[PDB]
Amino acid sequence: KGLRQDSNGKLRYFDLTTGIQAKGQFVTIGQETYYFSKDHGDAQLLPMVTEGHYGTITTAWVYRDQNNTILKGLQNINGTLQFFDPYTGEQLKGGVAKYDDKLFYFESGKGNLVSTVAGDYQDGHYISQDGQTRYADKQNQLVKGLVTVNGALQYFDNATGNQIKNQQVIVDGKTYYFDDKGNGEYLFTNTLDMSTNAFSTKNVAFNHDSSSFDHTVDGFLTADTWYRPKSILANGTTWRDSTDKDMRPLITVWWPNKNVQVNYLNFMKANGLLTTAAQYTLHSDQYDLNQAAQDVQVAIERRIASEHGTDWLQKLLFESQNNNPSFVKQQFIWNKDSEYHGGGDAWFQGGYLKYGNNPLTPTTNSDYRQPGNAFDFLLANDVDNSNPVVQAENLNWLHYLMNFGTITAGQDDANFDSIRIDAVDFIHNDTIQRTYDYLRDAYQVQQSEAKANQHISLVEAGLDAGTSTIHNDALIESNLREAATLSLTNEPGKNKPLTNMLQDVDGGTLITDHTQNSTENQATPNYSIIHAHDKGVQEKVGAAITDATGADWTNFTDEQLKAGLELFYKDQRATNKKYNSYNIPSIYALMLTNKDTVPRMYYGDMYQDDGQYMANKSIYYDALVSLMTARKSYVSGGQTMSVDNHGLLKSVRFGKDAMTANDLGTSATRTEGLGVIIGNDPKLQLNDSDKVTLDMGAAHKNQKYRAVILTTRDGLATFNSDQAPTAWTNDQGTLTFSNQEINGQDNTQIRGVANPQVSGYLAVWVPVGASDNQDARTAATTTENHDGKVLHSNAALDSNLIYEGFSNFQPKATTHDELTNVVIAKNADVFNNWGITSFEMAPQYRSSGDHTFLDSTIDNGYAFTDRYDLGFNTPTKYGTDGDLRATIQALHHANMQVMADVVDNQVYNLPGKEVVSATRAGVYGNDDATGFGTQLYVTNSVGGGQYQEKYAGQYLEALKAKYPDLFEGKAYDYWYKNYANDGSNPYYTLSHGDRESIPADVAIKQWSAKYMNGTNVLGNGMGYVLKDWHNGQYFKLD
Ligand SMILES: OC[C@H]1O[C@H](OC[C@H]2O[C@H](O)[C@H](O)[C@@H](O)[C@@H]2O)[C@H](O)[C@@H](O)[C@@H]1O
Ligand SMILES: OC[C@H]1O[C@H](O)[C@H](O)[C@@H](O)[C@@H]1O
Ligand SMILES: [Ca+2]
Ligand code: NA
């Protein structure tokens, strides 16, 4: 058998196991690779091409020889068969070429020849028939089997002609994947059958007990597994019964596919264990591959004897040799290539794996894992917030945070008062609804504005957070940030008109209208920002790093951050800004004077990260101080806003108790109210007769005004007392400006300017004569609410002001006194004096430090393992637990409430391993259609830490006794955002929820996969948990 000469001297081949003649295929025998004809089966020697190197031409691959000439057609290169266009010599990858008047497929990875294709079709058409898709050829006949259709590899079931979509399929000993559109790719070539010989039978496992195998997880075997065989070939010579000390690697005796087996033989050859000129390819006869593996095993046993051990073998197969990835990691099925990272729905970390169920994984299965919101995955280990036990644990943690001082040191003035729900749209609605009911039970926020306004909570979303807007349990983000991004933050010539600032609209739904706002309790309670720790900041700091160093987020060091931050602030301080927003003061002037919003100041707009906390003031500092100071003293009453014929935005507040322009107001009103004039065109010039007006209203006739902000040539002049330039209203309450100075006072004229602080125009005007302690704010009342809403947008809510008190890119403290939390406490009275009523602290959880995302590289507190560790023993980035308690006390003693950033979405760096069923998925929690399919997967899912062990579940029995309502099932409503098909505006419908009852007697002392929805991709591959790929059956120990 094998290669046999016929009666006319011609060569033919017969498969060494089956005896079938080779026709229309390639076969590697000895050192040589032959083709055998599809007609008579006549051999053809394909010359081995060694030397040369892979090339480029204008943009594709070729291969050039020893004499630098470009090779064409079929080529036998170092044990692979490749095809190069017969004219340009451009390498074919992922397609078919004709040879011997039939079709062969060359895979998309390396262009290797891997299989036969039945036909290639261009002229047929798809049909829908008996509930299926099929393909009919040019004679209207159904096409069957593995084919190409219009250049795409596809498969149609042989019996029916039904097209296969979203499945892995075995065709003639090769495994492919066909995506959601039926488009195909090669995965691997299968092994035929294992050596049934006496040698192989000695290699069978001693038994199926766990003591016979290692590197196992939950009873499953992995690529790293070593095992005890029945017998051992001691010394390379003598079969003996194995002992309990004999262990050998499973991948010396068994391979998941042919590609791995061939790669193994060649690797071993290259490292001394096989001496031969024989070539091992995908076209080698399986018999010869099986035999050569046995010869490798002989040589291993000889070396095990010489070395008195297996430590050399551990290294050879499983560790990086010469900077190269290990043998295991070189294989497709054991690396990230078989996980198909990325895609549009893979927002971070290369995308996600979603957990499912499997009969063999009872300890990781779940009856839950529904997203219950519009998004699901984002980062790291995604917490299943639909799970009843997890929802209880969320109440436990919330309780812990809201009583942190009481619990850790008996200090009742050192507890958080409100929350931020981080990544709200990525957690199940039941947990959000239940969280709001907790705040209701604990603080009676629903009773009146006086209770609600003591606990002003917020979420990271707009109107889409339907559980947050249905009863206005928390503030949503207004559309101001997005609107200002269109009309103010861009360079000259890239801003839209300011008419987009007149209404606050979220996908066509009105949040509040500024044009003529004389009402109260109409607007959706909201916060307005321009920047945040993660809104409009990273991307720009990243561009700065790159011009500065060459690095970016995927590779940057601590020195490179510092270098990037130097360039960042240098840019920020110039007129012409390569990376920074324009018109920041003007945007803050809008934020701080608009009616029906609670503004939130960002730390980073006031201070610079090229210094320690609060050390370096930003260029915008004086202007934002001046704006906060004037808001406290003057801003109350109604609003009007319009854009005039010169493009200038004119905004007026009338002052306390004046809702309209025609309101005569009361005696408090006369010295309150203000006027704001903004332009976004730095070349604005008025003619000599043009006027710009502010209609201050009927309470402000014949009245002197004074500047708070004026645009100057170089920047902005700021004034915090009545010693400033002045101007007078006429008998209707109108202020009138022009291109002339008023009474010779510099910077009172209207004109476009370009400087570091403004690109267009900014002025702010307040009535003269306020007392030194005038406070235009409105106190909350104890009056009972009757409309079902927790928060109401009115003068009292408008009187609050939030401070986001951190940045991602702040540096590490070098001393106690530099720690953020120690500096905050010391500066408490500064915040109170600015009118901050809510201090939003960073998340205080200890960072995982694992560098798998930005959060765990600059250690901001969003990426943690132990969510109860708030700086016990050694500090977080911001301080120790004792510092945190002192900060909360200091803020409370300066009349602020303090907000806890509650991060229910994920947990990082859980070192303990488990096995779970997994499929590729995106942020929406939709199954992606990838070659990974659905595989059992070794996840990093078990852990938590010392404070979770100490505190998780500890308060549940007492919470159930005090607020039993929280542990019951409950019916509820919420708004749901729908996207229209025809590209018109999203629209809101009312959804119904029914949360489940939850238990008080199961604690989550450590995370594990049964409490998780999934994980970011880990790079182990589609086949690191071992199975028989012929029938799909996992190896599992009993
Ligand atoms: O390194 C030799 C290599 O050169 C070409 O492929 C390069 C590169 O092409 C794709 O991006 C693949 O995904 C990579 O794995 C490849 O290394 C030839 O096409 C290939 O035949 C050869 O191995
Ligand atoms: O060309 C249009 C499409 O028609 C059918 O839906 C086929 O299943 C698909 O493979 C093809 O892409
Ligand atoms: Ca989630
Ligand atoms: Na509290």
From TrEMBL:
Coiled coil: none annotated. Residues 250-1038 form the Glycoside hydrolase family 70 catalytic domain. Ca(2+) binds at D376, D382, F426, N905. Production of extracellular glucans, that are thought to play a key role in the development of the dental plaque because of their ability to adhere to smooth surfaces and mediate the aggregation of bacterial cells and food debris. Belongs to the glycosyl hydrolase 70 family. This is dextransucrase. It comes from Leuconostoc mesenteroides. The gene is dsrE.
